[PDB]
């Protein structure tokens, strides 16, 4: 097994700037004069797309800006100028001999201007209450950077149990992230308290973005 | 245009069997080396099996972790690659891509989950905003609670709303997957025009359309 190690793991580049991703091989992938090293791009929810073969040569219709380099055991993938749609994970991959092996992957994030989340709170549905559960959901949409902190309050008392926090991948058009927080409770306990709140601290706002409801409203 | 469609993933018990198949078009299939590659969050991209063209005696190779359990084969007359898998294990769980011309082209992928947990249909709950709203746009939601295994597919108004939609990756809460999705439109559109959350869970043969209704007191 020829082991491939990429670095860095993640990477944030401004629009129009250089992105450089490395791939180190445990032994030489040179066979003949050709370095048998390929590069793939995987955007979220999609298969890997073939970009570069033979270390530096480009696949059909692959833009000029993607270009690789290196020989032997050390390889790079350069993206320059970087664009919004280049947000993806990039895998190096070795075809020198069986078994074919891939790298760990490197996420390229696109730097952009800061963006506050548009926060929306949602009580439980009528359907869910009559099932027996109660889930309060809070979408925090279209923000940057990825770092965000969500605090749930019930009648002003903080809660950490039952909370599910799912981030999206970076958007291919506006380079933002979005994120869903979900407080899950028994119906019995949902109806014991009145006020449900969803505090969200982000880089943008010093004081937190609050969104709130009370059940009799 | 090259097309690779996989089929026959799903849920199977440990020890059980499963046969993936892969239809291909847009290249002379009988000449192409074909592979299967899998992806899990723990192990990244694993090459699983190769089958070569008629000129190389339909030579097969396999990753060590599947030797003796997985058989790859092809029907050159039907442009199909098959992957028989036997004595399946939890670590065989992943997305299985069929690739053509080694890794030049990749299919969408098909999901194989190996687990003695039973299939479970999601409950699909609509999330309308708080009683009575006021901005120049409005966000609605859809909660897809407690399904197994992955995946579900979720669209809004049968695909008509692509922009405005953030569908969040699923998460494991109490051994079952929960998933949410927001949609944002201008406050003319809703509630006047009906917006509907469409959810399919192929593994349980579940298809639900849930209309988002405003909250009457």
């Amino acid at each position: 097994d020829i082991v491939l190690t990429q670095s860095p793991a993640s990477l944030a580049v401004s629009l129009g700037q250089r992105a450089t991703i490395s791939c180190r091989a445990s032994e030489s992938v040179d066979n003949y004069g050709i370095s048998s090293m390929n590069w793939f791009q995987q955007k979220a929810g999609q298969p890997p797309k073939f970009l570069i073969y033979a270390a530096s040569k480009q696949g059909s219709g692959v833009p000029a800006r993607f270009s690789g380099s290196g020989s032997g055991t050390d390889f790079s993938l350069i993206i320059h100028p970087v664009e919004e749609d280049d947000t993806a994970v990039y895998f190096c991959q070795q075809s020198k001999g069986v078994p074919y092996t891939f790298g760990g992957g490197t996420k390229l994030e696109i730097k952009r201007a800061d963006a506050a989340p548009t926060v929306s709170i949602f009580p439980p549905s009528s359907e869910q209450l009559t099932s027996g559960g109660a889930s309060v959901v809070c979408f925090l949409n279209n923000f940057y950077p990825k770092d965000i902190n969500v605090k749930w309050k019930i009648d002003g008392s903080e809660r950490q149990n039952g909370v599910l926090n799912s981030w999206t991948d970076q958007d291919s058009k506006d380079s933002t992230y979005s994120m869903s927080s979900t407080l899950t409770l028994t119906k019995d306990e949902y109806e014991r308290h009145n006020s449900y709140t969803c505090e969200a601290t982000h880089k943008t706002s010093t004081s937190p973005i609050v969104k709130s409801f009370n059940r009799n409203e | 245009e090259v097309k690779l469609e996989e089929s026959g993933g799903g849920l199977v018990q440990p020890g059980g069997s499963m046969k993936l198949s892969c239809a291909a078009s847009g290249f002379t299939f009988s000449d192409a080396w074909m592979d299967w590659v899998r992806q899990s969050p723990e192990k990244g991209l694993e090459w699983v099996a190769e089958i070569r063209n008629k000129v190389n005696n339909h030579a097969t190779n396999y990753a060590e972790s599947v030797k003796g359990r997985f058989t790859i084969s092809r029907d050159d007359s039907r442009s199909v690659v098959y992957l028989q898998m036997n004595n399946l294990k939890p670590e065989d769980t992943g997305i299985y891509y069929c690739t053509g011309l080694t890794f030049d082209y990749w299919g969408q992928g098909t999901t194989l989950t190996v687990s003695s947990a039973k299939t479970t249909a999601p409950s699909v709950y609509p999330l309308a905003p708080v009683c009575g709203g006021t901005g120049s746009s409005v966000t609605l939601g859809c909660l897809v609670k407690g399904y197994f295994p992955e995946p579900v597919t979720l669209t809004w108004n049968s695909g008509s709303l692509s922009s405005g939609v953030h569908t969040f990756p699923a998460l494991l809460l109490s051994g079952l997957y929960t998933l949410s999705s927001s949609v944002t439109v201008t406050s003319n559109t809703w509630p006047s025009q009906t917006i509907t959350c469409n959810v399919a869970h192929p593994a349980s043969s579940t298809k639900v359309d849930k209309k988002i209704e405003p909250r009457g007191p």
């Binding site: 991959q93 | 080694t102 890794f103």
Partner: peptide
Amino acid sequence: PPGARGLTGRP
């Protein structure tokens, strides 16, 4: 054109 092996294929 493509090889039998593919551009990503072994040498």
